[PDB]
Design a protein around this ligand. Structure first.
Ligand code: CLF
Ligand code: CLF
Ligand SMILES: [Fe+2]
Ligand SMILES: [Fe+2]
Lengths: 477, 522, 522, 477
């Protein structure tokens, strides 16, 4: 479609809305121009969702507990408030780890204060203090506790900070109050920020006066990789083959100690900008540690990233970088040779959270595919700035897309594949459009790095080319 | 590394030596991990009676609950009405979760809206969110009814749903005649099943409270059926099937089976089937109203009895042989329809299956959990099979329900080693299956982690999970199954006996060691 | 020893130390057993390509066949007729076996008589056995029809069934008009399926050959359906269900589903249901005749075409999506009835399930066996699912059939690593699953021993059995299942995907080792 | 029921039959008189079955291959002829063994010559010789082969004896021709005899001139225990605790060597009289080995048997006998205390093969149960002689019972339990009568010995008292 067809597509779709909603949604839909570097000239983002329009967004608790804190494997994370939020989010996100669950690691468990009426009426701080003692008795190898506030906590005026300080002091334990109530902000995004500031304020400074860490020139941390299906491990392997030492992973397969050791590193490598730029900036400000954005989706981006990272070190690392690249060349070339002919020319529309909607485009392009539409649940304009140069001219961008919009856009655009989430998957399959989950990787992955690209390619091929898609039309209709 | 013609996903990729060595290095360098001997020591302690005693003393901490929150149940209830949009007044994070939770169980779209109240609504309340939300929802998704429930934020700040909806109509945001039934659904009271009761009662009141004076009990010659919170498609279907075979006029009130099972034919259908408005409006003219899951339909029951003047019969959930028989006999009494030859034969086929499989079922010991009516029906059927339901866990059960189940246990010698637990969670259940090991668990997917824990103690201590309940996320299409009626009992029997025989085959598969008992015929 | 509160059966009693020591002493003292190192050596050799080559050069020896003998099929065919007694002329040992084989699969009574020919009959033949047998059978068991087949003794001696039955009528042992259809069923020709074809064609001839001159094709407005040898109740049922919902008049010719599923209600019913004599007599008046399992109904087809003048359509077994589609479209064409909304939706629900489950099915590799039509329908559906049916074994298959299956494989990229084997047995299949290891076997209970053998080599080599086919003796009530139509395809899909996910859960259950991938949601 | 009532019952049931069948069946049905010693005065047996009457009997191939030879674990048994007989009998009988199946032991396998039309027309002897070579190639650790003839072999005039001699000599292997064609005899019984004679003629004498086996005074063989569910093992254990050395088990868990060593024993202990009296008589005649009948069903019979066996030896064995009895006393007493009150007074009807219809009566009586009818498929009058004293007065006896007769007797007698086979089980369950399989033990057992009595008791109780039996009548009927 031309710029003008996409533009009239947007206008037609918005005709359904009452005027207030129509005027708002118009601001969140744009036709890409890769000439633009200021996205605040063409799309609005990180605003409230319009009531009743079936946003795909979640809340600040999802962005704090579900996203940032939950993966930290040797801490216990309390879903503090009523029973729902911890139950729906129990083991929904595939933030992989190595541990002995229920013993030294706790990620897929749901710890909750299960608020009842009396807790709402009289407050839950006494319950929280008792709950902490119960945790200590039954889970003695936990290395710290976080308190992930749900909607009621702030609303009823509880003081989880006092409880965390008093109990933390009494038990010589790191207990972290996190004010991530879902009434705060507009989406998962503010949850990330809240979570980052909680790490800063309650964990990150613990070893500030401790000089025992055996530091080297090659120490880095992977910042903002939550190890979905092992994504961080398939990144780490390459960084270490390149001669670097990955002191920490924030927060997929992450331990509290590796977080406390991060201020000792030489360089912070930021994959998820949206979720962990805040703490990255803090670390530069306080500790003088530089940070840099990278991308480990597909061979083209991965090679560029390895090279850009290696360039921050010495000749020995630059040399290893080229050895790594040479090692994996035949492997990814074989993936391309097998799968690109099966996918060349195919058109994809994406809708994801805060990073992937731009970050995966290169990987699609390494298989000859075109991303014809993309958008985010909860990105900010600094994300859109990074997106417009990665997308083609006259492609469709959508911020906090409504269910209606997404369906109507797909009907007109007729993508060969859609990459989005669980709430979207079954809608599009019924429409006869191959769908891949691009949050959970549809229970596959990893997708990061060279080993991830093989699985990514296999997966896009098995679904887009599956025999089922030829069968939706009964032969008598 | 990958070999292109045999690509490895996470399992078994990360077992390659280079990944293993990398992970060992990460652990040793940076994780400051407890020594393996200490991990082993603590694990072993968590399997003990001493640990169980401490675990059962918990007052403040909940671990691995076997319940969810009210509005989840209101949403499922709402989905069962024709062209009805579930609408949860409050915080949007909740709706993302409710939809995803059901998406994963049904492997289907699940449509529901929020009105996206934010922190700002704490000053003033969510009245404007309701006005625009209702207008936007109606225009955009074109439902014929919007069924309104609440999230906990809206409950804590005290928003008056009734007044907000009335004001929405007064100021023209939706038409006066447009149906907007509502219910308050606080997550900090009861559980998801309570949300279902509250929503249903709100819908029943909406369509009937003000129009009672023309109603005459029995004048439509039908029986109303209220299913409660139900996540097996086969359960809505079997009840309709049995009643139709019997020639009994009925109205199934909240019937999501079509919208939870649309065909993949090239279009998306946001709405399908469902109970009609005309069925709700005419419901007081029924002969009576039968509650399939009475232990979570108490508020509904009071409305049906007090306002519709229906003499709701005291019937257990129709699970197992006796309670299916009782349901059919009562429906026969109310309707005047004889039980047909087809159902008599079906019953006898179930009995035949019981006779054929009884030797493998006899004395088998189960731990089990779920919602109260499901759990008690499962207990009853297990007793009918000569099985021992030794650990009966219902996190969201109550004292009156426990007393009822304790009485059912007392009526059978197969209940003598059984204990019923209410308010306890799957971390409590984990202890019980270590300290008083049963043969199997019957439960939802959260059970898999208990099985994992038991195997770690040793193969001889492993307790296999049999997946019956909600949610089931790690197997495909089990939501099509049936647990009610003779069909459901036949399905449960089959699953149970074959789970027993599968485990026995595993235990006897050892060449020259245990395969003397690896029989071809069982 | 036993502890009275926890009595041990063979497993695990004989693992007690005293039994273990005793069995060791028996071995060492008296068994002159090959040393364990030699046993291990030979086992390892039996898993090799070298051994496979020797195995496939067999010409005289058969090991672990995947077929039975003709009269077993005649007996099953005969059971499908109203008040019909299967009667096998010849040796009574055969009948004890036929009954027991079906008893174990259906967990039901199986009624069949012999006329108990002994050695003395070699001199004169079995004429007197037939006379007294028919009279005795009729008086004692009061059938309305006696359907006669033969055992191999009767075939070798050359007994003329036709003459013997005629002489029985002439001499007054059985009334002139009492129906005694017959078929020669030599065990040394073809297999059990051939026996079914022979019996059916004999029954068809009996009721129609002499009365053709009043017959008009199409005059009764029905379609005849011939199921062939079928051991899933759900298969008879789904065909009748689909035809009824389309409003198609039909006659199912050989329909044992009632007699193989009588209720346990306090009486034994020797006969139940079945195709009526009136249906067989009126069958040439149908519009046409559809054969559900054409690859073992070739004799029947020649008779229906040549004598009834029905233009029997070229249809595959209605298994999977395409072939169920084709069956319904052809039935629509013949009958003039459109395919109704109910079946269109059911189809779309299958397709939905396929879209939901495709990622776990894709590329999965299967070894499979059974009867020719079942095997080819399973192959087709597996290709539709994006699976690879790499070892396709049909012991009783023929060359023309293999060519047909090789053509199906060629129509799909998913067939490119597949080979079809005819005349080979489960000892041949055992080699294939060692040398070219698939993910799963789909087969009958005899497959369990192959799984046992694979596990002995190592857990990483184990090939789990998925039980679909006949006989299934080591699980209960699987004979109630369905493999035909959209319902059958849904059941097969569900069984396959969940077998995949069970195995994955097993492989990822290892605490701290493989449980990183023990996902709650799949 | 009185004698006169049982006699009435027999005549009424016989009314359905044509005259020839009536006259015959009358001779096979009797009312017990335990005063009678010569059963040839009251019942006929081991005659042909009447055509068309639904005998429950099998054939000589079942008696030879299925019963006697099949259990021998380290030999390969060929079902020689068409495919049926070996397939229906594959792993049907639970003759347990310890071995590595397919490698050194072969019991649950089905080896067959799978006769086709060309084998019938031209003879199968060339195929058999080829088959033998193929067996040797593919199963090199087999210690011998048997050829189990099916119906066609003798009918077509094949010479399996010549093939067995010639191939056995060529390969230095024991290859045993067995003329057990199902046209021979009238039942499984003649198969036993044929099978015993084949052991005598081709196996048993192999070590007649070998003096290397070290015998002791306490050497015995268990003759006629086929180890159903482990029955022979739960017998052997007791004989050895009593101080005996069990050189051989014929044939459950049996090896060819232990059969060849049996002529070295001091005493043959016969459980199944019917199937192995022939070879027991032979061994007395040829080697001077005495034999004695015993019974290991239930504690009364097992105690009596242990004492009678020990009395054949010396004081040291008699002392160990009493030690064994003292050891197990509390075990079986506990079984009786638990289960007898659950079963006291309950009435059972049995129908089995050639031994169990009398042999299990004592075990039932040890639980207070009464055997009110019994009968056999293929017993001879020497079995009936042994039966009349074990059954109560006026009880019903039936030889080669017809399906019709068994149903009609059960409708009148209304036993509380029936003990029979797979072809009977489902009929009687539908009638609301608890049923236990008394061939296969309903996939349970062992039932022999003290350890077997516990299982027997558990099993009769679990079935007789099962809640299912109260549920056959719909409450609206
Ligand atoms: S935005 Fe929680 S699911 Fe809700 S009704 Fe309360 S218990 Fe139930 Fe975010 S923090 Fe949670 S998920 Fe919502 S409540 Fe708020
Ligand atoms: S008495 Fe065999 S089942 Fe028969 S028709 Fe021949 S192949 Fe088939 Fe005994 S030996 Fe065997 S089992 Fe019978 S045939 Fe004779
Ligand atoms: Fe679906
Ligand atoms: Fe049955």
């Amino acid at each position: 479609m031309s710029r003008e067809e996409v533009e009239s597509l947007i206008q037609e779709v918005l005709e359904v809305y009452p005027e207030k909603a129509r005027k708002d949604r118009n601001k969140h839909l744009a036709v890409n121009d890769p000439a633009v570097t200021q996205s605040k000239k063409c799309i609005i983002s990180n605003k409230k969702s319009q009531p009743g329009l079936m946003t795909i967004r979640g809340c600040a608790y999802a962005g704090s507990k579900g996203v940032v804190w939950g993966p930290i494997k040797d801490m216990i994370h309390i879903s503090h408030g009523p029973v729902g939020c911890g139950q729906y989010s129990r083991a929904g996100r595939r933030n992989y780890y190595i541990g002995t669950t229920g013993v030294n690691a706790f990620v897929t468990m749901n710890f909750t204060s299960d608020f009842q009426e009396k807790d709402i009426v009289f407050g839950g701080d006494k319950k929280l203090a008792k709950l902490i003692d119960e945790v200590e008795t039954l889970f003695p190898l936990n290395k710290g506790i976080s308190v992930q506030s749900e909607c009621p906590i702030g609303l009823i005026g509880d003081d989880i900070e006092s409880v965390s300080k008093v109990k933390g002091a009494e038990l010589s334990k790191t207990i972290v109050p996190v004010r991530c109530e879902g009434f705060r902000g507009v989406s998962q995004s503010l949850g990330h920020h809240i979570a980052n500031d909680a790490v800063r304020d309650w964990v990150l400074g613990k070893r500030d006066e401790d000089t025992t860490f055996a530091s080297t020139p090659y120490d880095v941390a992977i910042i903002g990789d939550y190890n979905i299906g092992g994504d961080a491990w398939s990144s780490r392997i390459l960084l270490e083959e390149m001669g670097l030492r990955c002191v920490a992973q924030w927060s997929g397969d992450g331990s509290i100690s590796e977080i406390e050791l991060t201020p000792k590193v030489k360089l912070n490598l930021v994959h998820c900008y949206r979720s962990m730029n805040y703490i990255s900036r803090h670390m530069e400000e306080k500790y003088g540690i530089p940070w840099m954005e990278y991308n480990f989706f597909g061979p083209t981006k991965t090679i560029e990233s390895l090279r850009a990272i290696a360039a921050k070190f010495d000749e020995s690392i630059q040399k290893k970088c080229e050895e790594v690249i040479a090692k994996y060349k035949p492997e990814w070339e074989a993936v391309v040779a097998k799968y690109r002919p099966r996918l060349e020319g195919k058109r994809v529309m994406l809708y994801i959270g805060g990073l992937r909607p731009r970050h995966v485009i290169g990987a699609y392009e390494d298989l000859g595919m075109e991303v014809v539409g993309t958008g985010y649940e909860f990105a900010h304009n600094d994300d859109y700035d990074r997106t417009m140069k990665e997308m083609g001219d006259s492609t469709l961008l959508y911020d906090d897309v409504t269910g209606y919009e997404f369906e109507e856009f797909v009907k007109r655009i007729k993508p060969d594949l859609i990459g989005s989430g669980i709430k979207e998957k079954f809608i599009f399959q019924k429409m006869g459009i191959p769908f891949r989950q691009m949050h959970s990787w549809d229970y596959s992955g990893p997708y990061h790095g060279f080993d991830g690209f093989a699985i990514f390619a296999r997966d896009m091929d098995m679904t887009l080319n599956n025999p089922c898609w030829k069968k939706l039309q009964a032969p008598w209709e | 590394s990958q070999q292109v013609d045999k690509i490895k996903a996470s399992y078994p990729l990360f077992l390659d030596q280079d990944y293993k060595d990398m992970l060992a290095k990460k652990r040793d360098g940076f994780e400051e991990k407890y020594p393996q001997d200490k991990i082993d020591e603590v694990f072993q302690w968590t399997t003990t009676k001493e640990y169980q005693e401490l675990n059962f003393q918990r007052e403040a901490l909940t671990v691995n609950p076997a319940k969810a929150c009210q509005p989840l149940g209101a949403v499922l209830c709402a989905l069962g009405f024709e062209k009805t949009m579930p609408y949860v007044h409050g915080s949007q994070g909740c709706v993302a979760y409710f939809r995803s939770y059901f998406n994963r169980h049904f492997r289907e779209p699940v449509s529901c809206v929020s009105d996206s109240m934010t922190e700002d609504a704490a000053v003033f309340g969510g009245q404007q969110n309701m006005k625009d939300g209702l207008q936007n929802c109606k225009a955009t998704y074109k439902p014929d009814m919007i069924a309104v429930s609440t999230t906990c934020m809206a409950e804590v700040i005290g928003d008056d749903l009734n007044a907000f909806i009335n004001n929405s109509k007064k100021e023209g945001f939706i038409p006066d005649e447009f149906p907007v039934p509502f219910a308050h659904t606080p997550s900090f009271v009861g559980s998801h099943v309570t949300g279902w009761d509250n929503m249903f009662e709100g819908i029943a009141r909406y369509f009937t409270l003000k129009s009672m004076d023309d109603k005459v009990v029995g004048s439509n010659k039908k029986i109303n059926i209220v299913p409660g919170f139900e996540t097996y498609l086969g359960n809505f279907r079997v009840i309709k099937r049995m009643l139709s075979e019997m020639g009994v006029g009925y109205s199934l009130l909240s019937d999501p089976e079509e919208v939870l099972d649309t065909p993949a034919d090239g279009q998306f259908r946001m709405y399908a089937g469902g109970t009609t408005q005309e069925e709700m409006k005419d419901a007081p003219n029924a002969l009576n109203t039968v509650l399939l899951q009475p232990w979570h339909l108490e508020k509904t029951k009071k409305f049906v009895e007090g306002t519709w003047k229906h003499e709701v019969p005291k019937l257990n959930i129709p699970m197992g042989l006796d309670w299916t028989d009782e349901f059919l006999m009562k429906v026969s009494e109310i309707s005047g329809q004889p039980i047909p030859a087809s159902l008599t034969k079906e019953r006898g086929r179930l009995v035949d299956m019981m006779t054929d499989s009884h030797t493998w079922l006899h004395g088998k010991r189960f731990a089990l959990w779920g919602d109260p009516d499901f759990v008690m029906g499962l207990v009853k059927f297990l007793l009918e099979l000569g099985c021992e339901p030794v650990h009966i866990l219902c996190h969201n059960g109550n004292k009156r329900w426990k007393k009822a189940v304790d009485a059912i246990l007392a009526a059978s010698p197969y209940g003598k080693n059984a204990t019923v637990y209410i308010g306890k969670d799957l971390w409590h259940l984990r202890s019980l299956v270590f300290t008083d090991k049963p043969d199997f668990m019957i439960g939802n997917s959260y059970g898999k982690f208990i099985q994992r824990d038991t195997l770690h103690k040793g193969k001889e201590f492993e307790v296999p999970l049999i997946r019956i309940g909600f949610p089931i996320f790690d197997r495909h299409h089990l939501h099509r199954s049936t647990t009610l009626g003779y069909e459901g009992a036949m399905q449960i029997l089959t699953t149970l006996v074959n789970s027993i025989l599968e485990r026995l085959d595993e235990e006897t598969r050892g060449m020259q060691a245990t395969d003397y008992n690896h029989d071809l015929v069982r």
